[PDB]
């Protein structure tokens, strides 16, 4: 049974789906479940109360949103099952889970229990013939066409840097942080309390994400921007009222380079990129600096790459040719690589079949991934 | 030598007096009385013209120091107890009014939760300040406030006022001058504060659950008493209404949020070593906490939320003790600032002076550089 | 009269000469707090040291000054010495002489800088730097025997015969307790117990001290772990939360015997000791096999002496009688040796003096050491 396999690119902020051998994912929507605030008398079997995808984006004010995933690790499993069911249902894909093999994605160094429970869902609740879980860094390199290079990525959940050199992923050189787009949105909300424009609800939290996406820029010199007085630029809400953003727009993404403003110790994006290159062997470091790949949504800030160069120039050895490459489609880079990986003839060998899972179990899935 | 000034600004009320005295000298409300004006305007406001705010602050400070302090603050220091997350725009305006107009020797913009912790005399504590506008949480561990662990729902005094205005308008019973419901569209805030202080009886956990069950498909409705009002229009306010207004403060469903849940979310964000000391020392301050029979309903609701499966996997068994302060619940933040200012002429040096303000530009807020 | 100060990378141990055990025992940490613009109440210390940093762990950035037995930050090491002398011991360094310890095959500049700080800053009357293995052998009582010393900084071996150290047969090893603690912390993250910050580094260290033990046979222990759940113990944290791990008890200290897990590409502690003995002269191997001394905290795992006996016998010829000297007080063996060395009358003529340091400089220590 070798049908056209489905590529479900997972993620805490956004989830993407479609088919193998395609240019761009046709079906992209944010990964959350929406429930009405003023719920009905019964607290068990709800009816007409679940919205996933564009319905939930349309009706924000009614629904109390909640993300099932946190830092690339699902907390609420029933919500992720409903989202996966919505992906497969007639509202998005219009195909059965029984026909096609599956290509799932996960962040590196996650809990194995969640990976096993993910496989349990795909094999038993849905009746998948074959499943394969893969890394985000390996997929990004497939999309670009390269074999060598570091893959710095910054989604909504996880920021991690995995150095790979001519098809050799280094496990001990991996760096990982719990500082990402969701956290950047949380501190922009914190800073907009200091501006005056307070936000509280989960639907109202998505306004802070929209402000982050549109009106934020990373300064080269943060001390110089602080000494200067900001202009206080404006932004219109979906309601109508104007908001003077002020210094919160530039101080919000500074987080990713300075996590001391949190009150929780993290490496940061710039250190993780350097540390991943440093932890690898001596001869591989110069090739890893030359081939630096960006990915995820939190790399799309204005003057992000210019700052990420300047931090590398500060930390890295002097007189070395740095090159932070970045594709046009940075958000979709991981899905494109999965579609390319799925289209290749080797894909049949890598996956975990349903029969092999029934015989062995979780051990066979752990062996095939690494 | 010189007893410093203490101020604790806010939207509803303003605690003010001398440093060293056990409790403030007076507490005039935040509003001001203007000649040729229908209604009294509030002083503490956000998102509004700079020059207007500056004039409003001068007007409030002028009526304050004569009546409260009976002195020129030009002789000695000041402690302006701003609540943390009070807008930087508003702080800059306060800094301008204190230095440019009046010309004080020194000022201080210190946080409310850390000073409220100085009253208890312990270095580590989870703190909750239920004021007028917001109900802010902030855990402190060994002096330093843990900032990213926080929470503040729009669920303080102003939310209770809005709910009282809604529920009274839906079910109204005014006397003649009987029937005639919904004659007046709105009602004044000062009267509605006096109703909250006197009438509103806070329910228990079991009573609250019974009220929530009744709202979505009636037990213990009494007691009910009328409220007198001016112009010969007494209104027969009910007993089930005031209990229903108090209930929305602890309403969990469909937001996953309440006054009780906000402490648990703050505890969730905090690290593992810090966790147990914050749970042991849970301080409750602010205006809404002065309500009668509030601390039980909170502590019982806190415990009920810990028993739920979602918080068992992280928190589990925890000894939630509520160490109460010496002064009253509203006036804990002020007493801390009075302790901070009176005793230490040394810790007055760390605060910003007039010499430093003119050349530099502004008092340093918790920000970059 | 004289003070002994074993400057360990983990636990800094110190006390007086001619004593049973040290008085001052604490972790060599210097926790600096979360620097935010918000104020702090009723005063506090800018940089904590020792047990104070361990008590108030949740906030402070715990940075060790010594990394692999190498002092990285010297201002941090100077604060810990100051904390040892004035606060803990309650005695000035000007009156008492000071015995110090470093691991063998260390950088030559580190002794010179250590000695400069003692004479210039601290104004010591007399000082000495000894090898840790030489003191560990001297605490045990024997003149002859190899010492497999292993702390959190550095594992190393020093073969000695009839009071004659063999400096060229010494073999320093990069594997140590800190690398085992980091490995345990990673495999904890693999089974859904994520510990990122440096406050949790001490909790996983404390888990490593309690639960973990050396396996007699690794493949057998892996097979029994899959079958039964009796080996799976539970450890409660400082927080009321309690966690259970099955595989990770025996798997953590196995990294000593299989460095391939950590990604070091080095010899294991079992065969590093063998390779040290083979580098010695052929006539004096029997006595080194007989007196295979252990010392340090990384040799305090239950059943490590049994595993060393199995592996060394497997490496060596069948005719040899292998024997591991594993005392009850091997955790504090380096300091006990320094106390006995300080107590002897022969050591009074072996000290460096202030006048000799002023004549020569820092380079005099290399002559005095060995």
In this structure, how many other beta carbons lie within 10 angstroms of the beta carbon of residue B29?
Answer: 16
The encoded tokens of residue C178 equal: 């800190």
Per the CB < 8 A criterion, the answer to whether B315 and B267 are in contact is yes
Whether residues A263 and B254 touch (CB distance < 8 A) is answered with: no
In this structure, how many other beta carbons lie within 10 angstroms of the beta carbon of residue B50?
Answer: 11
Per the CB < 8 A criterion, the answer to whether C239 and C158 are in contact is no
Q: How many residues does chain B have?
A: 369
List subunits contacting chain C, requiring 3 or more Cβ pairs under 8 Å: A, B
Per the CB < 8 A criterion, the answer to whether B7 and B14 are in contact is yes
Q: How many residues does chain A have?
A: 370
User: How was it solved?
Assistant: cryo-EM
The CA distance from B131 to B127, in Å, is 13
The CA distance from A5 to C94, in Å, is 77
The encoded tokens of residue A284 equal: 């591989």
Nearest CB neighbour to B365, from listed C37, C200, C241 = C37
Most A-contacting residue of B148, B149, B151, B159 (CB-CB within 10 A), to test interface: B148
Q: CB contact, 8 Å: B272 with chain C?
A: yes
The CA distance from C56 to C63, in Å, is 14
Whether residues B271 and A262 touch (CB distance < 8 A) is answered with: no
* B100-138 core/surface letters (b: 16 or more CB in 10 A; e: else): eebebbbbbbbbbbbbbbbbbeebbbbbbbbbbbbbbbb
Q: Which helix (H) or strand (E) holds B110?
A: strand B109-110
Using a CB-CB distance cutoff of 8 angstroms, which residues of chain A are in contact with residue B134?
A: 198
Strands B78-81 and B109-110: parallel
Nearest CA to B82 out of B363, B367, B368, B369 is that of: B363
Nearest CA to A27 out of A51, A58, A62, A53 is that of: A53
Nearest CA to B303 out of B319, B314, B291, B292 is that of: B319
What is the DSSP code string of C216-267?
Answer: SSHHHHHHHHHH-SSS-EEEE-SSS-EEEESTHHHHTTHHHH-GGGTT----
Closest chain C residue to the Cα of B267, Cα to Cα: C239
Using a CB-CB distance cutoff of 8 angstroms, which residues of chain C are in contact with residue A226?
A: none
The most distant pair of C-alpha atoms in chain B lies apart, rounded to whole Å, by 68
Q: C325: burial class by Cβ within 10 Å (0-12, 13-18, 19+)? A: buried
Between positions 138 and 177 of A, the ones with CB within 8 A of C are: 171-172, 177
Name B282's bridge partners: B126
The encoded tokens of residue B289 equal: 């906490």
Q: Which residues contact C320 (CB under 8 A, 6 or more apart)?
A: C286, C289, C313
Q: Compute, in degrees rounded to 10, the torsion defined by CA atoms C313, C316, C319, C321.
A: -50
Q: What is the 3-state secondary structure (H, E, C) of C279-307?
A: HCCHHHCHHHHHCEEEECHHHCCCCHHHH
Q: CB contact, 8 Å: C42 with chain B?
A: yes
Whether residues A196 and B46 touch (CB distance < 8 A) is answered with: yes
* A259-298 core/surface letters (b: 16 or more CB in 10 A; e: else): bebbbbbbbbbbbbbbbbbbbbeeebbebbbebbbbbbbb
Per the CB < 8 A criterion, the answer to whether B118 and B131 are in contact is no
Nearest CA to C64 out of C7, C149, C118, C18 is that of: C7
CA angle A103, A55, A208 (to 5 degrees): 90
Alpha carbon B284 to its chain centroid, in Å, reads 10
The CA distance from C176 to C69, in Å, is 10
Per the CB < 8 A criterion, the answer to whether B366 and B54 are in contact is no
Whether residues C192 and A172 touch (CB distance < 8 A) is answered with: no
Q: Chains A and C: how many Cβ contacts under 8 Å? A: 32
CA distance to B3, B334, B352, per residue, from B344 (Å): 10, 16, 15
The CA distance from B353 to B348, in Å, is 9
The encoded tokens of residue B369 equal: 């550089």
The most distant pair of C-alpha atoms in chain C lies apart, rounded to whole Å, by 71
- Compute φ and ψ for B176, nearest 5 degrees: -75, 165
* C326-361 core/surface letters (b: 16 or more CB in 10 A; e: else): bbeebbbbbbbbbbbbbeeeebeeebbeeeebeeee
Whose tokens are 């140590």? That residue is: C176
Q: How far is C152 from chain B (nearest CA, A)?
A: 23
Q: What is the DSSP letter of B350?
A: S
Classified as helix, coil or strand, C32 is strand
Query: Would you report the helix, strand and coil content of chain A in percent, each value rounded to 5?
Result: 40, 15, 40
The encoded tokens of residue B28 equal: 């005039």
Q: A61: burial class by Cβ within 10 Å (0-12, 13-18, 19+)? A: exposed
CA angle A6, A12, A15 (to 5 degrees): 30
Closest chain C residue to the Cα of A74, Cα to Cα: C192
End-to-end, the C-alpha distance of chain C in Å comes to 24
Helices (H), chain B: 50-67, 88-96, 112-120, 157-170, 189-198, 205-215, 239-247, 259-269, 272-280, 295-307, 309-312, 332-343, 354-360
CA distance to A276, B329, C129, C155, C172, per residue, from C68 (Å): 20, 53, 17, 9, 11
Q: What is the DSSP letter of C84?
A: I
Task: Reply yes or no: is the peptide bond before residue B223 cis, omega within 30 of 0.
Answer: yes
Using a CB-CB distance cutoff of 8 angstroms, which residues of chain A are in contact with residue C248?
A: none
Nearest CA to C77 out of C87, C88, C67 is that of: C67
Q: Which residues contact B99 (CB under 8 A, 6 or more apart)?
A: B107, B354, B357, B358
Between positions 287 and 346 of C, the ones with CB within 8 A of B are: none
The CA distance from A192 to A196, in Å, is 6
The CA distance from B253 to A172, in Å, is 45
Q: What is the resolution of this structure in A?
A: 8.7
* A92-105 core/surface letters (b: 16 or more CB in 10 A; e: else): bbebebeebbbbbb
């Amino acid at each position: 049974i070798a049908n056209q396999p489905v590529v479900i690119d997972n993620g805490s902020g956004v989830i993407k789906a479609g088919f193998a051998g395609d240019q761009i994912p046709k079906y992209c929507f944010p990964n959350y479940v929406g429930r009405p605030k003023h719920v009905r008398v019964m607290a068990g079997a709800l009816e007409g109360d679940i919205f996933i995808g564009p319905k939930a984006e349309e009706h924000r004010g009614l629904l109390s949103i909640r993300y099932p995933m946190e830092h690339g690790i699902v907390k609420d499993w029933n919500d992720m099952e409903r989202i996966w069911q919505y992906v497969y249902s007639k509202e998005q894909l219009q195909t059965f889970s029984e026909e096609h093999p599956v290509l799932l994605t996960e962040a590196p160094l996650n809990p194995r229990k969640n990976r096993e429970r993910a496989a349990e869902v795909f094999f038993e609740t849905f009746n998948v013939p074959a499943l394969f879980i893969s890394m985000q860094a390996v997929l990004s390199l497939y999309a670009t066409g390269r074999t060598t290079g570091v893959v710095l990525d910054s989604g909504d959940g996880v920021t991690h840097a995995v150095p790979i050199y001519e098809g050799f992923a280094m496990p001990h050189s991996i760096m990982r942080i719990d500082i990402a787009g969701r956290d950047v949105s949380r501190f922009l909300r914190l800073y907009l309390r200091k501006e005056g424009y307070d936000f509280h609800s989960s639907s109202e939290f998505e306004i802070v994400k929209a402000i982050k996406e549109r009106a934020c820029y990373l300064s080269i010199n943060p001390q110089k921007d602080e000494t200067l007085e900001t202009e206080k630029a404006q932004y219109y809400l979906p309601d109508g009222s104007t908001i003077e953003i002020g210094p919160s727009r530039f101080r919000a993404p500074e987080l990713l380079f300075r996590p001391d403003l949190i009150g929780e110790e993290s490496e940061g994006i710039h250190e993780v990129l350097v540390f991943a290159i440093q932890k690898s062997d001596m001869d591989l470091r110069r090739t890893l600096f030359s081939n630096i790949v960006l990915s995820g949504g939190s790399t799309l800030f204005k003057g992000f790459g210019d700052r990420l160069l300047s931090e590398v120039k500060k930390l890295a050895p002097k007189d070395v040719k740095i090159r932070i490459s970045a594709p046009q489609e940075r958000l979709y880079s991981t899905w494109i690589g999965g579609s390319i990986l799925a289209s290749l003839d080797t894909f049949k060998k890598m996956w975990v079949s349903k029969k092999e899972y029934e015989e062995d179990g979780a051990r066979s899935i752990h062996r095939k991934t690494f | 030598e010189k007893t410093a000034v203490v101020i604790d600004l806010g939207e509803a009320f303003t605690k003010c007096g001398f440093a060293g005295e056990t409790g403030p000298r007076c507490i005039i409300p935040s509003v001001i009385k203007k000649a040729g004006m229908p209604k009294p305007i509030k002083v503490v406001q956000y998102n509004i013209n700079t020059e207007e705010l500056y004039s409003y602050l001068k007007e409030f400070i002028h009526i304050l120091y004569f009546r409260h302090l009976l002195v020129n603050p030009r002789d000695r220091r000041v402690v302006v107890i701003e609540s943390v997350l009070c807008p930087s725009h508003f702080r800059e305006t306060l800094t301008r009014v204190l230095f440019k107009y009046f010309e004080v020797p020194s000022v201080l913009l210190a946080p409310s939760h850390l000073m409220a912790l100085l009253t208890l005399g312990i270095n580590s504590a989870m703190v909750l300040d239920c004021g007028y506008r917001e109900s802010l949480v902030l855990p402190i561990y060994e002096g330093i406030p843990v900032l990213n662990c926080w929470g503040a729902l729009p669920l303080g005094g102003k939310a209770l006022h809005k709910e009282l205005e809604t529920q009274l308008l839906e079910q109204c019973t005014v006397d003649t001058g009987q029937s005639l419901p919904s004659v007046m569209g709105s009602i004044p805030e000062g009267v509605l504060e006096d109703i909250k202080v006197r009438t509103c009886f806070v329910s228990d956990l079991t009573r609250g659950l019974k009220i929530q069950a009744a709202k979505f498909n009636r037990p213990s409705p009494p007691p009910n008493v009328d409220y007198p009002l001016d112009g010969e229009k007494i209104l027969h306010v009910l007993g089930s209404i005031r209990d229903s207004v108090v209930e929305i403060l602890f309403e969990q469903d469909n937001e996953e949020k309440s006054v009780a849940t906000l402490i648990l979310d703050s505890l969730m964000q905090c690290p593992i070593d810090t966790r147990k000391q914050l749970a042991e020392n849970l301080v409750i301050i602010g205006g809404t906490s002065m309500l009668p029979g509030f601390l039980h309903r909170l502590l019982a609701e806190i415990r009920y939320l810990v028993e739920k499966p979602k918080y068992k996997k992280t928190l589990g068994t925890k000894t939630f003790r509520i160490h109460t302060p010496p002064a009253k619940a509203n006036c804990v933040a002020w007493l801390g600032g009075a302790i901070f200012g009176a005793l230490q002429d040394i810790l007055g040096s760390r605060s910003v002076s007039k010499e430093y303000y003119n050349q530099t530009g502004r008092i340093p807020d918790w920000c970059s550089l | 009269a004289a003070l002994v100060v074993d400057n360990g990378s983990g636990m800094c141990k110190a006390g007086f000469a001619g004593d049973d055990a040290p008085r001052a025992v604490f972790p060599s940490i210097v926790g600096r707090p979360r620097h935010q613009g918000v104020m702090v109440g009723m005063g506090q210390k800018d940089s904590y040291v020792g047990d104070e940093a361990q008590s108030k762990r949740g906030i402070l950035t715990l940075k060790y000054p010594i990394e692999h037995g190498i002092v990285t930050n010297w201002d941090d090491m100077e604060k810990i010495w100051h904390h040892t002398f004035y606060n803990e011991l309650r005695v000035a360094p000007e009156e008492h002489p000071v015995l110090l310890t470093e691991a063998p095959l260390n950088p030559k500049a580190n002794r010179e800088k250590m000695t400069q700080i003692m004479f210039e800053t601290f104004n010591t009357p007399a000082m000495y730097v000894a090898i840790q293995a030489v003191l560990s052998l001297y605490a045990s009582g024997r003149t002859t025997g190899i010492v497999m010393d292993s702390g959190d900084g550095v594992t190393h071996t020093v073969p000695i015969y009839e009071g004659y150290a063999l400096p060229h047969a010494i073999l320093r090893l990069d594997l140590a307790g800190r690398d085992l603690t980091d490995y345990l912390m990673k495999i904890l993250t693999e089974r859904g117990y994520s510990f990122t910050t440096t406050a949790e580094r001490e909790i996983v260290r404390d888990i490593k001290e309690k639960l973990c033990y050396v396996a007699l046979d690794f493949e057998q222990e892996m097979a029994t772990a899959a079958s039964s759940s009796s080996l799976e113990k539970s450890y409660e944290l400082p927080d009321g939360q309690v966690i259970t791990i099955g595989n990770e008890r025996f798997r953590c200290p196995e990294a000593l015997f299989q460095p391939s897990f950590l990604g070091m590409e080095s010899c294991g502690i079992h065969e590093t000791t063998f390779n040290s003995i083979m580098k010695c002269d052929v006539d004096i191997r029997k006595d080194l096999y007989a007196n295979t001394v252990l010392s340090g905290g990384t040799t305090m795992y239950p059943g490590i002496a049994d595993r060393m006996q199995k592996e060394i016998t497997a490496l060596a010829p069948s005719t040899m009688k292998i024997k591991i000297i594993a005392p009850p007080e091997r955790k504090y063996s380096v300091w006990i040796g320094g106390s006995i060395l300080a107590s002897l009358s022969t050591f009074q003529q072996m000290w460096i003096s202030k006048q000799e340091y002023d004549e020569s400089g820092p380079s005099i220590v290399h002559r005095k050491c060995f």
